[PDB]
Structures are given as structure tokens and as C-alpha cells.
Design a protein around this ligand. Structure first.
Ligand SMILES: [Mn+2]
Ligand SMILES: [Mn+2]
Ligand SMILES: [Mn+2]
Ligand SMILES: [Mn+2]
Lengths: 328, 328, 321, 328
């Protein structure tokens, strides 16, 4: 995987973010999603890779663009592509927190090719955090006690993050019972997991159930940032089992370690759409010095080197024109 | 008012925010509110003012501490005091966005002594925005068209903020219909209005109904930051009408200009509790160089000088102790 | 001292910095110092203290300042870097420190040998002026957990520092030079992302006390020794109560008890950013100052970015008092 | 040029800056220079370009690596390359301000092929600045009067930067006489010129004489950032004249507009070595969340799109090992 591919990925997430931002607060999640898919597909076909989508918008049946197996790129090293054109379609449509655009790449087979099913998740940051510090079969109490001890703080100092859903009431009750602070996000458990390893996020642990593709994407970032995560797929009906079987997943009760979700040489890239726990959103900026531009905030990271790059980009634009000129 | 009072007010909002933060994500909004009220009252009584609460926790009937009319301070210049010990008690208990502590000071009679009722609000930023650019009796569309013209942008560039409530559906639908982007916050329309005049907030306009005290405090800040706002009190039942009559208000449908909400020499201070669209929340920080601390982010501003100070404070703390040691 | 005094002090350094900035790069050291002194004296006389200048310039030794309050000794520097500000060099600051009566070394205006390192856990003895430069740096490298080659040592670019510079480079350290501003240079050792690990050099005794006051709040260690070259200097020491001429002063001997330290950047430097002209459509035009205020008893540290409204169609000297 | 080349260039300047930093403050300007040359050369040969060095370390006579005419890169689109492995060799050896590493790319013939001679320079930033706002044959006073009018300020507000040299005494004295503020840098007039177009540099104008190669490099950045600049080569002896003649330059007194220095599609990249008035230098950082790393601060920009990216990169490193491990 050529060093060139890493920094090229940020252009993809930036262009998807700008397209998504033009639909921010338009009340239309489908238009938000399609703006991102279109921008990302077009940008990805300029990237010098021999790319196969292993996580994307869906099966070819249901998704015309960025479907599983689709071939993308202008030609280059062979890579598996995990992508999320718009993490937070509903978020973006109402301008909520934590919307992102996300692109990750691995050598062939480096990702768990996750089906569209739910996934139990537990994640903690820290480059020195050991394997086994968290696991999903241990109680919440016992996981937090270990985390607090490793971080060297009282339990009440820890900030635990989960989604505000009925399915999480027991995580929340238990975490609070042993003394921790638990904050709720409305959506965007990609940002919420990655935040555990993000300097100054204010989030120490993530515990929740959400999308499985999102779990792999977040593991890909934690692999570069440092941290630990365990995940397990959930299967509620026979169609979900069939989706897994079609992707080669047959050990349904497997507990996945972070190395099982994303392994080898991983590149992770993301751009903020709205302000979130991980990344700032797109903003309109005026200046006499340079004129008006849209500013994006992005991150690109690589697991092998552990180089993490924070990128602020200034994109020239006349806001006298319609904002949908940021589409494609 | 003696220039000393301005900067002393930040210490008050800081200690109240640290107390609030100890209850963040504990699912107990009464405990968060009380931690805030306690810390803020103890800190005020060390400020060198002869203070009279004109906006606070409530009437002496319902609020034992920081009630309307309470005298606070160690002695000094006579000021009316508008307080919100914790903007976002529910926010704070769940760790939502936009929780703040707030304190504003004016010469005697400078604030609208608002009864505790709903208030319709429209706000826009810009030191050169003219009085009349926004008006509650004009349509959303016409307000937006004027704002867009004044800012020199296409309508679709504008980001309108409002609270996610059924009472705002008509605002949201109309603003989208003429092409604007409308983002929703779950609570905290102090931050929401003030964001219109905060650099890099990504928010251009606020339209919505919320608390009347909060409207006054936001107007206090906008007086210092620059901008325009119009409010109108709303009355649901006859007891609310009596609360207005007791405060001297008989023109129930009076439209208040920003100068009617806050006039004269005004000091506005606020500290973030959680991350919001105005201020960052309190964070736990480690360093070998300094040891561990809590970081607060505050702003204090003054309407006469127009000076705005952004203050990042490092508060030493051993996080092996219980987080509630940050309470007063 | 009443907690009020700390945050009142930043206003003094800010006003002095704005006045200095109006003389930045004008080639007139005298006019810069006079602008700073005026602004500082005027602001100080609104602070609620019974202050006495024990380190100062007019703001002379023994001058009584303040509007009335707790008694404090005042160590001030209306403009650390008059030459600096006049030429637009790096590391010009305005500085105010306050202590309880007798908290500062009452230092004659003489030269002082200095060595300093940052870190709240640094023990007394980590630095010592009578150990070789090499043994000082080996201990600091051990304390910081790094190879010697990682350490960045700061000193002033002066012929009197050639032996320090050569000995530190010989043992493998990286030695960077500043043209002026050893207040900033010393405090940098305890300032996040200054990139300075150690300061070693000779400079003004007043400036050493001021830097020590800050390091007492930020955490670190420093040692100092006064230099006497002329009989006039020795008598200045005697008149101030100093008779042990070769005393090595620890950091607690320079600044003890409850200390407040305030500074504002004039030009960009190793510790603080300088004043800038800013334009915005939302907010209009303003001068931005960058300040720090700190207190030794609580170890609280406040960083303050202040936007001062101003129409830069008018002359800059309107920022004078 | 493929938009892939732009972001690949930052890796080159980052690697050269890290190598330079290992020699910072070691009092050896040659070893600093060689560390940077080595690292830039090696990195450059992994960039997918067919590159020809038009501005480099020297003529092949005197420079073995990165010489004028040298062919570099792994293969791709044809570009002319304007390099400065280490701007501020003496700066770096003393840890002074404004040391940078610099890589610029243009279409064939896009750069003035500058001889190793001195160059008179005047520069101002701002996208709307018209050609003629600055001119080397106008007085200093008249240049500054136009610049004050263009920026909408009193003359006393302007900050004029020059190098602290005897050859600049008349500039310094004239600029001060007409009321401007004139600050002095010891070295580093690449950074000093680009500062005029860099947000928050505090520098409005650069006026001085310095290296002609460094003038082309700074003009390349200003073409991306917006601004105007004029330059004239000066010749002190016969050997300097033939330096020009060898590179095809016989009009010895030509005044070059910025378009004459750098024209067409230009990419410009730089990384700070030491803190300066354009970029921050490399720093050693410790964190518990991430471990220890060297942090670099870079900028990459493009004249056709006007897109500018600020890049903060964290390079994992164990600082118990010798710092010379950052060499190539
Ligand atoms: Mn999605
Ligand atoms: Mn409240
Ligand atoms: Mn002085
Ligand atoms: Mn060079």
C-alpha cells in the first residue's frame, strides 16, 4: 500500500463532507446520503488504487453506488475499501452532533466484512491499554473498575459514552450505580467510539450496540490511535444470518478483538460534517485576505507507522451562489 | 461599576461549572442544579458588589437560594444581577450539548426583570446589523431574506438554529421552504442565540421560543458582542399574567428590542459545562509537567468597552479523589 | 492576598502591553519604556492593594502604588525587552508579580547567573550552578525520561555564554539561542509546547526574580547567583541588605510565600504570543492580547485572550494611556 | 498535475524538517543542511512525478544531491521542482526563528530559474491587491501609503518586516519616518515574505534584499495565498553575473512581477523546523493517551484552486533513543 494513498484519501472524505454539508439541516436524510455517496464515488475513482468495496452502502441489489464488491479507483495497489459516505444521515438532516464522512483502506482481507446488523461494542483508548482490559462478557462494573485502575483515577472521574436508546438503559443504570458519569449521544457511535482515543474529547469509554459496519470503521481508527475494543455481531432474524453467510461470516457468536476487525496496514480517514466529539464540522468563513471559503477538519492515520495527521482545509467558494454547488 | 467586577465574575461561573461537571452524566437534574446553585452562591458572596438578584432561580416562595430580590455580595458598587447557575440541568444530567453557567451584571434597573415565562426570540449577529433587520411580526422568510442580503450570501448558505420542539415546526418548515439550512439543538437557547454572534460557531440566525430569563441573558451578551434581537413574552394562564403585573408589565404583547432587555453598562460571564456551540465543556487533563487538572473555558465581556476575554483555566485536582470534591 | 488581586493584575499587564505595542518597531527604546511605564502606573493605581515596588524601574524602588488594600510587594517590569520592543524582536513581555511583604529577594540591579528547569516533580538540587553543565543536563535528561540529544537548552546569544553553549553541545544536547528576553526564556522551561527544556545563562537580577515567581506557580526548579564586577554594585547590594555576595539563591529564596504572576505578550515569543491587529465581519476590528495569570498557593493558571475594540483608521498611539 | 502530487509533497517537507530538527542547535550548519538534503532526496524519489530540479541545493559542480537539472521522482507527470531542503541552515544550527523546509512544483518552465545571487524584494498579501500596489522603484513611503489605503488602516498600524542587516538601514529609517512600525528578523525571508499573506502573522509588508532562490519560493506561495510581490536580481561581481548568464538571464536589471517568478499551476509545501512567523517548529510531545511523538506543522497549497491545507502531524517516537534517528 503506497504511502501516497493515505493523504489522497482525505480529499475523498473532504469532498463527501462538503456535499453532505450542503444538505445539512434540509430535513432530508435521503438527499444528504445521496449527496455524500455521489461525491465519494466520484472522488474515489480518482484515487490511485485497485479498490474493492468490502463495507459500503449495501448489496448490489439495494445500492446502485458503493455496493459490496464494487470496483473503484483509477488503478494501483490492490486494497479492500471500507467506507461510510455519511455517518449520520439523520444527524446531518437536522444538524445534530457527530456527523462524519469516513474512508478506510486495508490490504485484501484486512477488515471484517461486516453485514448490516447490530453489533455490541466496548472501547477504551490509550496506547498502553492491554488486551483483555475490556471484554463484553464481563459486567459493566468490572470493565470500568479495570479501566479506572489502568488510567489511575477514581471511578467517578470516568466519562462513559453510549447512545440514548432504550436498549442501553441497563448499561447506563449499572455504570452510574458504581459511580461513573455517563453521557448520551443521540447518534454517531463512530465518533463516540473513536473519541475514547481522541485527545481532549472528554470521553474515556464507549459501551453500546450500534451498526456493525460502523464498529469496524471505528476499530480501524483505534488500531491507528491506540486502544482496545471488543465487538460481537447480533442476529435477530434469519435474513440477518443469511446476510452474514453471503459475506462469509458463519461463526455467529464470535467475540471480535480489535485485531479481528481491522488487521495489517490500515489507513483511516474522516472529515467532520457537523461539530462532534471527534471532529469539528464544516464552517463558512469570510476574509478580506483570501475571500470566502468553506473550512473542513479532517484526520488521516496509518496503523503501521502510527502517524496521525490533523488537517484543516480552506476551500474557496462564493457564498452568493447556491450551496448545492458543493455537490459532487 | 469598577473594572474589577468584570474579571471577578469569571471565578463565579468557573466554580459553578466545576460543581455542575461533577454531576454531569449522573441522571439527576436536581443534584446538578443544586450543586451549581450552591457553588455560585458561595462564590458571589466573595465578589465585591452590593448585588440584588433580579433574574435567578425563582421567587422566594419556590427557591431558597439565589431568589429574586436576594442581596448578594461582599459589598461594593450597586448592581442588579441576572444569574443562571446552570443553563442545562437536564443537559448536564445526560451530558448533552450546550450546558453553561451564566452571570450578568448591570447598573440598577438595566435588565428587564422578566417573569419566568416563555419568550419568542429572533437573533442575528454582526456589529453592523441594524435595528430592524429582524422583527417577530414579519415572516420567517422576510427576516431571512434581509439577513441574507446584509451578510451578502445566498439564502441556502444561512444556518438557522432552533430548539427541537413541536412548537417550532412552522419555523423549521418555512425557513427550509425558502432554501435555508435549519439545524436543531435539544436544549440551551442561551448558547443558541449567543452563537449567532460567536466567531466560527457555524450559526447565523436563531429563531425560537424558550425561557424569558435566558432570553435576557443572551441579549446581555449580544449587547457586548454586537447584533440584534427581538423578544416577546408569552402567557399561558392567568397566574403568569399576574406574575407580569407584579413586575410592572402590563403591555403583554410588547415587542422588546435588545436595548429593552439589557441596557447600560453590562458585564456578561459564562463558563462551559459540556461542549456547546458557544463554549467548550470542562475536561480532565493529565500532564507530568503540571500534574492533573480540570480545564474550564469561559468568556467575560463588557458592553461599554466591548472588550471580550476568552479564558482557559487550569484547576489542579487529584482525580484519584472523588469528583464531587469539585462541589462547594 | 484577596483572590481579586490576581485577575486585576492581568488588566495591568494588558494595558502596558497595548501601550508598548504602539511603539513596537519604532526604534525608540525610551519612548516604548515610557509608554509602558505610564500605562502600568496608571492601571496599578486602580488595583486594591497597598503595594510597594521592591523590583522596578517612573515606577521606582519603594514607590507606593495601588488604591488601598492588602499589603504586597510588587516586582514589576513595565516592559521586559525595551530594546526588544523597539526593534520588533521576539520575547517582549509586560510583567507584574505580587507577593506578601518580603516575599521577593530585593535584588540590586546587577547581573545574575541562572539555571532553570520545569516540572512539578523536579527536586531541589536537580540544577546547581556549581555542577558542570554536563552533570546538570544528565540529571535533567534522567528526570525527563529522554536521551540527552532530545534536550533543548536555551541561552542568550552572547559571548559570555560561549563556554556553556560549547559544553552543552559537547555532551550531545541541542542548544538554541535567543537574542533577548531571559524572562521568557526561563519561564519557557515550564510552558507547554515552548520546546525549551532548560535555560542556562547570565542576565538581569530583577528578571531572574520575576521568572522565579512564575516558576513557583508553574512548577520547576531554578538557582541563581548575583555577579559583582564593580564596587558600585557591591554597595547597591549592601544598601539592600545583601552581604553574602556569593550566595546561591534557590527558587524559594527568590520568591517565597503566596505569589501572583501576570504577563502579557508584546511581540511573539517563547512563552506568549504578541499583540495582533484583527479584522472580522462579525465582530469588527480589534487588537488581540495574550496573557497568563497564575498563583503559587493554588497552582491555578489562567490563559486569557482579550479582544480590544479599536478603529485602526486612527493612530496606533491611541493605545497609549 | 494530478491532485495526488500536492498532498504527497507534504511528506517530503515533513521528513526533511524532522531530519533538520535533529541537528537543531548543534552549531553545525553543514550537518543540518546535509541531513535535510539527504532526507528530502530520498523522500522525493518516492513521489510519483517526473521531476527536474530547477531550484535546488546548487550546481552539480558544488552539490552532489538535489542539483540544478537533476532528475527526481519515481515517475509520473512532468514537473519543474523548486526545492529548499533547509531554509535557514545557520538558523537551524543556532535554533533561531523562521527555519523551514520547502518543496514547490510547477508545470515545465513555471519558475524563474534563479541564480545564487541577491534579490531585492517587496511583498504584500491579500487576494484583492492589484499589480502595482508594490514597486521597487517607488519610495518606501509611497509603497506604504498605498498599502495602508488598501488595508483600510492608518499608516502607524502597518507592520513592516525586514532582515536585521546594514543593507536595510535606509528601508528601516524611511519606513519609521513616515510612521510605520518596522520589525526585524535575524534571518529567514522566505517565512518573512509569506508572513504577509499568513493569517495572524502580524506582518503586513516585507521589504528587503535576500537570496534570489528564496524569492522564487516565496512568490510561489504568494501565488497560492494571494498577494503581490516584485523582485530584482542584483549583481555584486563578475562571478554573480555569469551565474545569471549560465541560467539564461542577461537582462540583469529586469524587475520581476510575481507572475514572472512563478506562473501556472503551482503546488507549494513547507514544514516548520523552528518556530517562526509563518509556521511553528517541530516539538517533542508526551501524552498518556497516545505515547510520545514529534509534532510537525505544515502547509500545502495550490494556485489553480486556491485550496490551502494546514497539517499538524504526530510522528511516533521513543525519545530514549538518539534524536539522530529522525535522520534518513
Ligand atoms: Mn452512512
Ligand atoms: Mn438554569
Ligand atoms: Mn525594564
Ligand atoms: Mn537552503
Amino acid at each position: 500500500m503506497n504511502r501516497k494513498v493515505a493523504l489522497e484519501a482525505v480529499r475523498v472524505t473532504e469532498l463527501a463532507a462538503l456535499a453532505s454539508w450542503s444538505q445539512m439541516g434540509r430535513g432530508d436524510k435521503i438527499a444528504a446520503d445521496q449527496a455524500a455517496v455521489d461525491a465519494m464515488r466520484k472522488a474515489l475513482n480518482e484515487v490511485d488504487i485497485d479498490g474493492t468495496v468490502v463495507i459500503g452502502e449495501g448489496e448490489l441489489d439495494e445500492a446502485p453506488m458503493l455496493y459490496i464488491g464494487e470496483k473503484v479507483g483509477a488503478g494501483g495497489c490492490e486494497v479492500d475499501i471500507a467506507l461510510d459516505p455519511l455517518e449520520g444521515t439523520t444527524i446531518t438532516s437536522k444538524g445534530g452532533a457527530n456527523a462524519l464522512t469516513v474512508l478506510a483502506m486495508a490490504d485484501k482481507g484486512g477488515f471484517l466484512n461486516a453485514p448490516d446488523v447490530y453489533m455490541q461494542k466496548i472501547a477504551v483508548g490509550g496506547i498502553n491499554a492491554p488486551k483483555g482490559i475490556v471484554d463484553l462478557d464481563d459486567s459493566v462494573t468490572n470493565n470500568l473498575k479495570r479501566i479506572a485502575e489502568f488510567k489511575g483515577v477514581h471511578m467517578s472521574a470516568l466519562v462513559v459514552c453510549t447512545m440514548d436508546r432504550p436498549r442501553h438503559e441497563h448499561i447506563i443504570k449499572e455504570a452510574r450505580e458504581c459511580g461513573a458519569r455517563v453521557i448520551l449521544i443521540n447518534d454517531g457511535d463512530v465518533s463516540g467510539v473513536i473519541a475514547t482515543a481522541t485527545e481532549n474529547s472528554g470521553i474515556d469509554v464507549y459501551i453500546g450496540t450500534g451498526g456493525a459496519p460502523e464498529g469496524v470503521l471505528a476499530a480501524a481508527a483505534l488500531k491507528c490511535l491506540g486502544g482496545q475494543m471488543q465487538a460481537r455481531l447480533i442476529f435477530n432474524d434469519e435474513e440477518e444470518i443469511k446476510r452474514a453467510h453471503r459475506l462469509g461470516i458463519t461463526d455467529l457468536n464470535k467475540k471480535y478483538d480489535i485485531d479481528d476487525l481491522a488487521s495489517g496496514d490500515i489507513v483511516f480517514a474522516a472529515t467532520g460534517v457537523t461539530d462532534g466529539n471527534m471532529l469539528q464540522g464544516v464552517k463558512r468563513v469570510n476574509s478580506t485576505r483570501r475571500g470566502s471559503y468553506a473550512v473542513t477538519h479532517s484526520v488521516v492515520m496509518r496503523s503501521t507507522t502510527k502517524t496521525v495527521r490533523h488537517i484543516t482545509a480552506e476551500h474557496s467558494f462564493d457564498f452568493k451562489e447556491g450551496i448545492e454547488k458543493f455537490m459532487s
